[PDB]
Structure 1
């Protein structure tokens, strides 16, 4: 068998049936004779390709396979890879290399020092020393991406390898099962359980890896058992807990002082599936106040090592969440104090307040909708105003890199055809990966895109303010007509200039059969 035949058999045998790509000449010998049990999903730019694959992998909780063109195609995707590294997304990224006989002269399309290109944003980066080694290298990539902590991997393949003979012994790769579904040994687990049972005022902090493991329901039970308030860790890439559950306290502000303040008085704080912590703003203070002890459960040795405080357990989030939920005692303490309701902001008949938009979405959207957030100045209000009951209901660029939400929303929707995806994106953020719109139209993926148009990089103006920074250039982005861009890529488009048009536009969008973009005029 050829490297080509053996490689597709490996992918198939390992559950891969979809290739997200943008093609090039180094990739044609791989893409030729494309098997009928595979589908290829085309996007017009590599950030869009990876972004879509990323959404797909996160929502489906399975690895996604990607094919890109040499260095330029790989390079165009590196921004998306930075997000993917932060979200522990299992992405298998392959790039075509020049034919081996032409690598030495550095012919055009040669990916020079290829394995170094995507570093440091990948768990593993590699180019095989021979054609017969390709299926083995593909095996490694698959497993490296899939083992905890999950993440993007990179494989470069000289295009003449595909037609060479495969090692007959490659058949051994086909059914390899590799598991990292592990938890803390019985002895130390019981110690942890006693600490949780003995705490007088415990708190729970949940991260994106909970939602990735679909450990949400086990965490609910755990929180109910302990009667503990539940926070989502800062800079949340996903939503790990029902946001209207009695225990839920909301999204932590991404500041050192703000967080030690929030956890004051809690004797034991259990963090699960989050870095400790993904701070953002400079907010100097204490990591923890005295009297507070912190225990972190993470699937990532890098997270365990860099936490500046607390104990850590490196283990599978699914296995640990399940064991803990079923081992801890039912506490007779009182549930946390009901959270206040978010205020209704006064709305005139002009441009829309973000809060008006979120209140209206929360009224009209289905209970199992899935939201994506790339409206960077409105995150806090979004978390306060959207009731998200189910797992896998929220995505936000995990490295803060814009250009994620628009293509990711397509990948999510492709992964969850029965759940309505609604992407809330600022006019600024919309541009980074605008061309992803075409993929939604072409394949008829019925994502809804709500563009929050206030003419400016809102978040940057805000930071500029608190910084007292005057005469900063480049903060405004006037003169973009999103209905026309949507038309350009074949996507139905609406406009909402006021509350009544917003209601009407959403009503129409939910009823539509394909993708729809709504430009909303929002206040400055």
Structure 2
């Protein structure tokens, strides 16, 4: 067998059947004779390729496979890799290298010092020392991406390797099963359970790894048993809990003092599947107030090490959430009462308040919709106004890197063909990966893109006003016609300049058989 044949057999035996790519010449020998049982999803720029694969991996809860072109292709994807690192997305990034005979002379398209290029944003990065090692290196990439804590990996392959003979002993790679589905030993788990049972006023904080593990329902049972309020850890990349459940208390503010104040009076705070914590703004104060102790369950040693407070347990979130939910006592305390519904903001017949947009989406979207967010000045509103009952219903860029939601919404919609995906994206953010629209058109992936057009990088204007920073350049983005951009890439386009038009456009989009972009004129901040 050839290295090409052996590698595609390994991929299919490990459950991979789709290649997200933007091709180049070092990849032609890999892509030739492309197997009939695989699909290839083309995107026009590499941030788009990796963003689509990332949404696909996060929603499917399995690894996604990417093929990029040498150093420049890899480099164009590195902002996307920053997000994938922070979301623990299991991405297998492959890039083609020059033929081994011309690496030394640094021929055009040689990826120099290749394994160092994506660092520090990957768990593992490697170029094999011979062609026959390629299947084994690919096996290592598959398992490194997939083991907890999941994350992106990188493999560089010289283009001449694919046609070489494989090692016949590579067959032992095909069916390897590798598990990290582990939980705390019985004695120490009993100690933890006793501490939870004994708490007088416990609180629960959940992060994205809960949704990645599909541990949401177990966390619902855990919060019901403990009769405990549930927050979402700050800078949330996913939604880990039904947002209208009586225990839900919303997204935590991303500040040290704000969080310790919120948790004041809670004697035990159990954090599951989050860093402790992904603060953002500078809000100095106490990490916890007196009387509060924190216990973190995380799948990631790097999270456990860097927490500035609390105890930690490094284990699988699915296994731990299931065990805790089934072991704790039913508390006799009263179940928390549900948060009140948000107020209706006054809306005239002009430009839309973000609050109006979210209320209208919530009124009109299916109960199993999936939302993406890259409208950063409106995040708090979005979290208050969308009822998200089910797992896998929210994604936003985990490292703050713009250009995620537009392509990721296409990959999520590919992963969940029966759940309507609705991406809510600011006018500034929409440009970073605008070419991803073409992929939705070409493959008829029926994502709805809602562009919040206020003409500015609104959150930066806000922060600048806060800092009392005068004379900051570069904060306005006038003069972009998003309906023309959508036309450019083959996506049906609608405009909503007021509420009547928003409702009409959403009705049209929801009925449509293909992707739709709605440009919404929103109020300037």
**TM-score after normalising by structure 2:** 1.00
Deviation by residue 1:19-40 (Cα, 9 ceiling, x = unmatched): 0000000000000000000000
Q: SS at the partner of 1:58?
A: helix
Equivalent position SS for 2:434: coil
Q: Output the CA distance in 1 between the equivalents of 2:471 and 2:359.
A: 35
Checking the alignment, whether the CA contact within 8 Å between 2:42 and 2:439 is kept in structure 1 is yes
Could you report, residue by residue, the CA deviation over 1:55-90 in whole angstroms, capped at 9, with x for unpaired residues?
000000000000000000000000000000000000
Whole-Å Cα distance in 1 between the matches of residues 341 and 315 of structure 2? 37
- Residue 122 of structure 1, CA deviation: 0.0
Gapped runs of 5+ residues in structure 2? none
Alignment RMSD (CA, Å): 0.4
1:358-388 deviations in Å (ceiling 9; x for gaps): 0000000000000000001000000000000
More off after superposition, 337-346 vs 513-522: 337-346
User: C-alpha separation between the residues in 1 aligned to 2:339 and 2:211?
Assistant: 23
Offset, 1:342: 1.1
Give the 3-state SS of the residue equivalent to 2:508 in structure 1.
helix
Q: Distance in 2 between the 1:231 and 1:466 partners?
A: 26
What is the alpha-carbon distance in structure 2 between the residues aligned to residue 13 and residue 179 of structure 1?
16
Q: Deviations 1:306-335 (Å, cap 9, x if unpaired)?
A: 000000000000000000000000011012
Q: What is the rounded CA distance, in whole Å, between the counterparts of 1:30 and 1:422 in structure 2?
A: 35
Matched position secondary structure for 1:471: coil
SS of aligned partner of 2:269: strand
Q: Deviations over 1:240-299 (max 9, x none)?
A: 000000000000000000000000000000000000000000000000001101000000
Aligned to 2:408: 408
Q: CA–CA distance in 2 between the matches of 1:269 and 1:92?
A: 35
Report the equivalent of 1:343: 343
Q: CA deviation at 1:494?
A: 0.1
Match of 2:101 in 1: 101
Give 2:14's aligned residue: 14
Query: Residues of 1 paired with 2:78 and 2:504: CA distance?
Result: 39
Separation in structure 1 between the aligned mates of residue 313 and residue 97 of structure 2, nearest angstrom: 40
Q: Tell me the SS of whatever aligns to 2:483.
A: helix
1:97-132 deviation line (CA, Å, top 9, x unaligned)? 000000000000000000000000000000000000
Q: CA deviation at 1:338?
A: 3.2
Do the aligned partners of 2:52 and 2:408 also contact (CA within 8 Å) in 1? yes
Q: Contact 2:244–2:338 at 8 Å: present in 1 too?
A: no
Give 1:190 shift. Answer: 0.2
List per-residue Cα deviations over 1:195-237 (Å, max 9, x = no partner).
0000000000000000000000000000000000000000000
Distance 2:4 2:344 in 1: 59
Q: CA separation in 2, counterparts of 1:474 and 1:159?
A: 43
* CA displacement at 1:301 relative to structure 2: 0.2
- Residue 435 of structure 1 aligns to a residue whose secondary structure is helix
What secondary structure is seen at the aligned counterpart in 1 of 2:65? strand
Distance 2:13 2:202 in 1: 45
Q: Distance in 1 between matches of 2:340 and 2:6?
A: 59
8 Å contact kept, 2:245–2:338: no
Runs ≥4 in structure 1, deviation > 2 angstroms? none
Q: Is the 8 A contact 2:10 2:173 kept in 1?
A: yes
Q: Is the 8 A contact 2:47 2:80 kept in 1?
A: yes
SS of the equivalent of 2:95 reads strand
- The alignment of Structure 1 onto Structure 2 pairs a total of residues equal to 524
Could you list the per-position Cα deviations for residues 467-521 of structure 1 after superposition, in whole angstroms to 9, with x for gaps in the alignment? 0000000000000000000000000000000000000000000000000000000
Distance 1:514 1:323 in 2: 42
- The 5-angstrom pairing of residues 109-258 of structure 1 reads 109-258=109-258
What is the deviation of 1:343? 1.1
Deviates more, 1:13-22 or 1:331-340: 331-340
Aligned to 2:456: 456
Q: Secondary structure at the residue paired with 1:470?
A: coil
Q: Any conservation in 1 of the 2:446–2:513 contact (CA below 8 Å)? A: yes
Say which SS state the counterpart of residue 356 (structure 1) adopts: helix
DSSP 3-state at the match of 2:171 = helix
SS at match of 1:378: helix
* Residues 398-452 of structure 1 deviation map (CA, whole Å, 9 limit, x = unaligned): 0000000000000000000000000000000000000000000000000000000
Please tell me whether the aligned partners of residues 248 and 338 of structure 2 are also in contact (alpha carbons under 8 angstroms).
no
C-alpha distance in 2 between matches for 1:326 and 1:49: 41
> Post-superposition shift, 1:339?
1.5
Q: After TM superposition, list the pairs within 5 Å mapping 1:421-460 onto structure 2.
A: 421-460=421-460
Q: CA deviation at 1:453?
A: 0.2
- Residue 336 (structure 1) shift: 1.9
Equivalent residues of 2:11, 2:17 under 8 A apart: yes
